[PDB]
Design a binder for this molecule. Structure first.
Ligand code: MG
Ligand code: MG
Ligand code: MG
Ligand code: MG
Ligand code: MG
Ligand code: MG
Ligand code: MG
Ligand code: MG
Ligand code: MG
Ligand code: MG
Ligand code: MG
Ligand code: MG
Ligand code: MG
Ligand code: MG
Ligand code: MG
Ligand code: MG
Ligand code: MG
Ligand code: MG
Ligand code: MG
Ligand code: MG
Lengths: 181, 187, 124, 53, 50
RNA sequence: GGCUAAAUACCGGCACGAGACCGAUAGUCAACAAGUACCGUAAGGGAAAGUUGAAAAGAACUUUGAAGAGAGAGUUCAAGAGGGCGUGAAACCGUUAAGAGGUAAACGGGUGGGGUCCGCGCAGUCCGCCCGGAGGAUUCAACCCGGCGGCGCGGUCCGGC
């Protein structure tokens, strides 16, 4: 497992990645550029807003046909959208990265998104039926995603309303755990 | 710009033998020196005929060498041919000859020697006749080849005695029309 | 003869190196490693070779004797010279000029001897 | 039915056997063929007929 | 260059522009110089010119 | 009316040997569960598809997640070889770094500026002879013993082939 970059101080960094993730590469590349350089608490809060349509992801490169919104003015841009799957997929990776920081004894409240990169994964083949007995490609565009988080001097605590929540129990996990035991 | 044509600048002539034979090239080294460092035009002619091709070096028969070495005033002169001296069975008596050649056929050697003659090589001619003095340079018939029968005016023109190219010779092979007035025409 | 043997090997020899627009010859008794009629060490009746001694001290001057031209085992006479630099060169000069044994290789033999002796000095 | 085979005149083939033998009796040519014959007593090298047995 | 001028300029040995030659004058040569009139400047050189 | 071995033929079959042949878009269509999968009512048509490693030692265990996936850990010479895995090109894409940006870009010639690296640079060559100062010796020439070699019209020596 090789990342495109190397952490400056490996003892002060945590990693996360995923491959062949079935989220649109174009939407997710734009989403990743939004949170690049953010503090983890800021990045987590921002992505939740995107899910709720309270903050937009500016579409700068892959902007052909995208629409205008008032929330894109926060980024010095006119085109923005609210990719929900891209935000949720990246939130999962941040949660995994945060856990990797804990497993390494880092201060999760100081982490900053130092490096983040979205790569196109191999495409998946479906098909669609066209007029005159013709069949055309219907391709998914998944991506690989890798992020590195690094400790900085700014500290931002986790929100109180987020730490007060119950540790959700999963029955289906318990069933499989008991079967494995 | 200079007003001149360039199509004839390069002269087509041999500066060396196409042959890779190392003995022939050792003789060319020899006569390159003699032609350069002596004023003898004979050396230049021999050097030139060492470059010449196989068809430009026709074989000289024994009978023809005897004829040319029997003209008055040619007694005790070495006959020289840059080529092959072939035997001629139509000769009855061979006189005493002194000859220099590139090759002499096996039967021509026995007949020349058996008459008391001397057969030289071109490296021995240089030591004996460095400038070519007392020599009779001789050539075989150059037009004595089957190709020259086919050259000239095309066979189907008036007073053309050129030989045609026929796969077979006989009454059924290019003799009707154009070769007798009874069939169209003759010329 | 030498000339006839040069026509065979001038471009076909196991000792011939053609490379980098250059030609050399690796056979023994070639004083300049040169693919040449003069410096070839095999085709002439008389040849001169200068090589370092088995130990890195002195030179060995090889001369081809006159008699055993077809007997390679006794063909070459070796002589080791381990004197001072100027005395070594004098012997080689005398071995060539006084004997009139290839006087055209005199300076090539002397230059090769000076290159072997120089190579036997301590490396700085 | 490519023409894989070649006719060579007998006189020329024997010519070639004669040149090979003449060139085999010269140390320079045998050395130039790469053979280590720097100590062979003589060339051509003839050994008694015992070796055939 | 027209064929007749091209031949006459070659006989004068003026095969290149600004080439020069002396030409001794007489009926034969003066009429050659008339054919090549557009292609040449000529005249009588003094001793210093020679 | 009739029979008759041999020398001759042989891209099918059984069993073999070889090659200046091809080397996985090549060579048979077929190096592999190929006349297979698949198409056609049928006669017929007919592919793609080789490679972890020396050895499965094929990644136990911990931890985030519903999981796929990750982070550690471990095997191995190497997973910078992780089960469609040898190497791993180009097109195309992400990111990082540098530079730049209103006549689409690109291009030839000429310079200039800035980089990357190279000289494994930064008091600047090497050699012959000669002069002078300091030293030190397997110390020179000339002669004597021995060995070897070259040449000799030895003006015309002996013996050999
Ligand atoms: Mg559009
Ligand atoms: Mg529309
Ligand atoms: Mg239909
Ligand atoms: Mg020009
Ligand atoms: Mg031209
Ligand atoms: Mg021409
Ligand atoms: Mg029958
Ligand atoms: Mg293949
Ligand atoms: Mg195939
Ligand atoms: Mg392929
Ligand atoms: Mg290939
Ligand atoms: Mg295939
Ligand atoms: Mg491959
Ligand atoms: Mg490796
Ligand atoms: Mg590998
Ligand atoms: Mg392998
Ligand atoms: Mg592969
Ligand atoms: Mg690989
Ligand atoms: Mg790049
Ligand atoms: Mg930039």
């Amino acid at each position: 497992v090789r990342y495109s970059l190397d952490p400056e101080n490996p003892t002060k960094s945590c990693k996360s990645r995923g491959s062949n993730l079935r989220v649109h590469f174009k939407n997710t590349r734009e989403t990743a550029q939004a949170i690049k350089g953010m503090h983890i608490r800021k990045a987590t809060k921002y992505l939740k807003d995107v899910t709720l349509k309270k903050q937009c992801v500016p579409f700068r490169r892959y902007n052909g046909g995208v629409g205008r919104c008032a929330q894109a003015k926060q980024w010095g841009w006119t085109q923005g959208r609210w990719p929900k799957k891209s935000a949720e997929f990246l939130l999962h990776m941040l949660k995994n990265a945060e856990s990797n920081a804990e497993l390494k004894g880092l201060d999760v409240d100081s982490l900053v998104i130092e490096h983040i990169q979205v790569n196109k994964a191999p495409k998946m083949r479906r098909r669609t039926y066209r007029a005159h007995g013709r069949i055309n490609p219907y391709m998914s565009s998944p991506c690989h995603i890798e992020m590195i988080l690094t400790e900085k001097e700014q500290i931002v605590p986790k929100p109180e309303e987020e730490v007060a929540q119950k540790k959700k129990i999963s029955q289906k996990k318990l069933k499989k755990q008991k079967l494995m035991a | 710009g200079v007003d001149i044509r360039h199509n004839k600048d390069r002269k087509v002539r041999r500066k060396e033998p196409k042959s890779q034979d190392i003995y022939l090239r050792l003789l060319v080294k020899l006569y390159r020196f003699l032609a350069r460092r002596t004023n003898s035009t004979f050396n230049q002619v021999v050097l030139k005929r060492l470059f010449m091709s196989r068809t430009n070096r026709p074989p000289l028969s024994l009978s023809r060498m005897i004829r040319k070495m029997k003209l008055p005033g040619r007694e005790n002169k070495t006959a020289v041919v840059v080529g092959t001296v072939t035997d001629d069975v139509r000769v009855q008596e061979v006189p005493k000859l002194k000859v220099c050649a590139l090759r002499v056929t096996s039967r021509a050697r026995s007949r020349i020697l058996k008459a008391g003659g001397k057969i030289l090589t071109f490296d021995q001619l240089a030591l004996d006749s460095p400038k070519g003095r007392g020599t009779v340079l001789l050539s075989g018939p150059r037009k004595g080849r089957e190709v020259y029968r086919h050259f000239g005016k095309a066979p189907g023109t008036p007073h053309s005695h050129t030989k045609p190219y026929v796969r077979s010779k006989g009454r059924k092979f290019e003799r009707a029309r154009g070769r007798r007035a009874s069939r169209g025409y003759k010329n | 003869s030498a000339h006839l043997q040069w026509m065979v090997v001038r471009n076909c020899s196991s000792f011939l190196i053609k490379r980098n627009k250059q030609t050399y010859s690796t056979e023994p008794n070639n004083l300049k490693a040169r693919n040449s009629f003069r410096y070839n060490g095999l085709i002439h009746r008389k040849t001169v070779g200068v090589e370092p001694a088995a130990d890195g001290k002195g030179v060995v001057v090889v001369m081809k004797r006159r008699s055993g031209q077809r007997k390679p085992a006794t063909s070459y006479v070796r002589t080791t010279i381990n004197k001072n630099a100027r005395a070594t060169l004098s012997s080689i000069r005398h071995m060539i000029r006084k004997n009139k044994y290839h006087p055209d290789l005199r300076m090539a033999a002397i230059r090769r001897a000076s290159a072997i002796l120089r190579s036997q000095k301590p490396v700085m | 039915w490519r023409r894989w085979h070649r006719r060579v005149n007998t006189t020329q083939k024997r010519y070639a056997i004669c040149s090979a033998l003449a060139a085999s009796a010269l140390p320079a040519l045998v050395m130039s063929k790469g053979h280590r014959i720097e100590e062979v007593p003589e060339l051509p090298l003839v050994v008694e007929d015992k070796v055939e047995g | 260059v027209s064929p007749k001028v091209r031949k006459v300029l070659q006989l004068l040995r003026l095969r290149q522009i600004f080439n020069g030659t002396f030409v001794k004058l007489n009926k034969a040569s003066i009429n050659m110089l008339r054919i090549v009139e557009p292609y040449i400047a000529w005249g009588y050189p003094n001793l210093k010119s020679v």
